[PDB]
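Supplementary Methods. Inverse-folding protocol.

Structures were first reduced to a discrete structure-token string of length 258. This string, shown here, constituted the complete conditioning input.
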């Protein structure tokens, strides 16, 4: 009876195994754009993905992760609210059963069809495993998806999903360029928070881009053909794998722009 997104194992249950679920710095949150203070001391965000090397894509039973070879200094996030340099290890998405929901963060209560999370670890902690033991171990770039025009650079991901339909399936996934998932502007909001899945550790500097990317209805429909279950188990579509907004608890949200 492991955690999931269903009625009996979903977000409202997670606190029993992971009491930090009711902690002081839980994610996601609703971003009240009217209360985010423009911090003119925030430096330009630097997203440097030109040497990124993807390895594999995996259905982990909750989402699918595109994992990177992070053994060298190759795909780094720095600047903005961050001290030091953070290295890309994986990205994944959260999405809905319908276009009207799916994002974890919300913007003045608005939900997007999906949300991309590019997960980076603070290089001063040596690797991901030790970084998640630190309150500033991770920096996650969050990007909203809306349904409209297709995102051409997403199509390579969409096309491999049929090979990882069920929990535990993985495939080789090399030479994927995550620059093709980024919107024009790097305007963002930033706040301190957590992983949005168990173990819900409070190690994340969140950097949520204001500008969504557009994906096609057909692209997100293919996400919704994935399965939460393993092969040879009853089929449960992987949809609505998002945690809802959590209490802000007097954290503050900063803005990179006016
Ligand atoms: Zn996520």
């Amino acid at each position: 009876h492991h955690w999931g997104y269903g009625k009996h194992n979903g977000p409202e249950h997670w606190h029993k195994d992971f009491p930090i679920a009711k902690g002081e710095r839980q994610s996601p949150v609703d971003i009240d754009t009217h209360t985010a203070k423009y911090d003119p001391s925030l430096k330009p965000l630097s997203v440097s993905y030109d040497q990124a090397t993807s390895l594999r894509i995996l259905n982990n039973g909750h989402a699918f992760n595109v994992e990177f070879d992070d053994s060298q200094d190759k795909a780094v996030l720095k600047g903005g609210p961050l001290d030091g340099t953070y290295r890309l290890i994986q990205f994944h998405f959260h999405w809905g059963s319908l276009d009207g929901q799916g994002s974890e963060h919300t913007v003045d209560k608005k939900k997007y069809a999906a949300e991309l999370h590019l997960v980076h670890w603070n290089t001063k902690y040596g690797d991901f495993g030790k970084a998640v033991q630190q309150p500033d171990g991770l920096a996650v770039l969050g990007i909203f998806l809306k349904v409209g025009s297709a995102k051409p650079g997403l199509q390579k991901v969409v096309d491999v999903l049929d090979s990882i339909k069920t929990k535990g399936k993985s495939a080789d996934f090399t030479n994927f360029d995550p620059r093709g998932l980024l919107p024009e502007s790097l305007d963002y909001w930033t706040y301190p928070g957590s992983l949005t899945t168990p173990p819900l550790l409070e190690c994340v500097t969140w950097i949520v881009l204001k500008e969504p990317i557009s994906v096609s209805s057909e692209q997100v429909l293919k996400f919704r053909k994935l399965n939460f279950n393993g092969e040879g188990e009853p089929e449960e579509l992987m949809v609505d794998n998002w945690r809802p907004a959590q209490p802000l608890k007097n954290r503050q949200i900063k803005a990179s722009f006016k």
